[PDB]
Amino acid sequence: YCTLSSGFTTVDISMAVGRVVVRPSDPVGKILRKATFPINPNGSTLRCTSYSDTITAALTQNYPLSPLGNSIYSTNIPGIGIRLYREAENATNFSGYYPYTRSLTPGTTYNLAQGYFVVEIVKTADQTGSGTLVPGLYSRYYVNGHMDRPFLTSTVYGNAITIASSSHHHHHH
């Protein structure tokens, strides 16, 4: 089982990007935007007693996997997928895509590493929509017994991620 430092505090990442244009000429699979957000740890730590204790990088939107698989999940916008993970500086220490669960090592004091939370916005179908990604919690990174106090969450606030399909612009030739 795992114990948390006194005053353990989740770090929340505000997922936000400038308006993402997606065009008919973009291929399915296009990384329309990879956006990074600094993870600034706050000193929270935890320590566990068993190799059966785990950390989980979980997705929370409960949207179906997109037709592209590879951890690209559908969103509320047609033809637009979202994929989440973490990195350190210079794209090192790739976490692997959310979701995953791994066992921890007993006795090790864990802290959140300085680095980056990553949002990828992906074209998942030929026909793409426009509009505002649905707000709310998108991920939590937590140890067993403490899903209610994650190390790290990521959340969309309000209209922070918008998609513009250029076909919808009705360009006057």
Numbering used by the authors: 1 to 173
Task: Quote the authors verbatim.
In Abp2DRBD, two 310 helices are present, one at the C-terminus and one between β strands 8 and 9. The C-terminal helix results from the six histidine tag added to this construct for purification. However, the 310 helix between β strands 8 and 9 forms the anterior loop of a large, open depression (>200 Å3) located at the distal end of the RBD relative to the linker to the pilin domain (and by extension, pilus rod). The carboxylic acid residues of the citrate are coordinated by the side chains of the amino acids R86, Y100, R102, and Y141. Y100 and R102 sit on the left-hand ridge of the binding site, while the base is composed of the Y141 side chain, which emanates from a β sheet on the opposite side of the receptor-binding domain core (β strand 13) and R86, situated on β strand 8. The R102 and Y141A mutations reduced binding relative to Abp2DRBD WT by approximately ~70% and ~90%, respectively. The crystal structure of Abp2DRBD shows that K34 forms a salt bridge with E87. Therefore, the K34A salt bridge seen in the Abp2D structure is holding the anterior loop down, keeping the pocket open. Subsequent analysis showed that equilibrium populations of Abp2DRBD skewed toward a larger pocket opening distance, indicating that the anterior binding pocket loop in Abp2DRBD is flexible but predominantly favors a more open conformation.
